[PDB]
Write a protein that binds this DNA or RNA. Structure first.
Length: 158
DNA sequence: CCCGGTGCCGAGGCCGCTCTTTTGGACGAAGACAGCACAAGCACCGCAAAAACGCACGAACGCGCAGACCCCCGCGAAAAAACCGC
């Protein structure tokens, strides 16, 4: 990864791409950017795969297997403005000494997101039909995330 | 003062019974024992852990800047209803 300052990186990319005809690719069934975690404290991108969940953070990357997710809680905060999504993980995530058996995410209730799943029509029909929607309309981010987590981990949302 | 005779007390006889000691001399070898399990507490060593303090670092908030928005300010009109009277 290069950092090219100035208004310059797009021209640099175009020349390189044209030189060897580089073809862009798309991975991860679904990604959610800029999610606020209360525990661990910080902001994380959540990338979901068939067998595993990735949390990408500026200082810490975590790979959680879908089997290690024991429980999903979807709980409204009493402030009537934020919604909490809570993951119980076993083994608990580690940052050094004390650990994170619970991941606490905080959403705004008014935050809406539109998301298309990165799946082929044959794989969707065979594995995910009736578990996931092919496209989610502009609904609240925490609902889409809770449904995706339910479909991929096969855990009931509490 | 005297006679007839009987039933009452004495020191002793004797009978059936209960209590006591004893059961030959010398020698050898082997085998199994000879208070215990149980009890609370003293004086002491040790590990697991608390409430709080000290340090490091990463991100979400403040600061700074250029932009879009509508609260705020100012204006004029109409008359509901508040303040006064008997």
């Amino acid at each position: 990864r290069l950092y090219v300052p100035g208004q310059k990186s797009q021209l640099f990319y175009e020349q390189l791409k044209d030189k060897a005809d580089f073809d862009t690719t798309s991975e991860a069934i679904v990604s959610f950017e800029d999610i606020l975690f209360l525990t661990p404290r910080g902001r994380f991108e959540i990338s979901m795969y068939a067998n595993n969940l990735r949390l990408r953070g500026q200082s810490y990357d975590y790979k959680i297997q879908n089997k290690n997710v024991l429980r999903i809680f979807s709980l409204p905060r009493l402030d009537d403005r934020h919604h909490l999504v809570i993951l119980q993980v076993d083994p608990p995530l580690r940052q050094g000494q004390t650990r994170y058996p619970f991941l606490v995410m905080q959403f705004d209730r008014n935050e809406e997101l539109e998301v298309e799943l990165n799946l082929s029509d044959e794989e969707y029909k065979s594995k995910y039909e009736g578990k996931l929607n092919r496209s989610y309309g502009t609904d609240s981010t925490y609902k889409i995330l809770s449904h995706c987590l339910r479909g991929l981990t096969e855990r009931r949302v509490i």
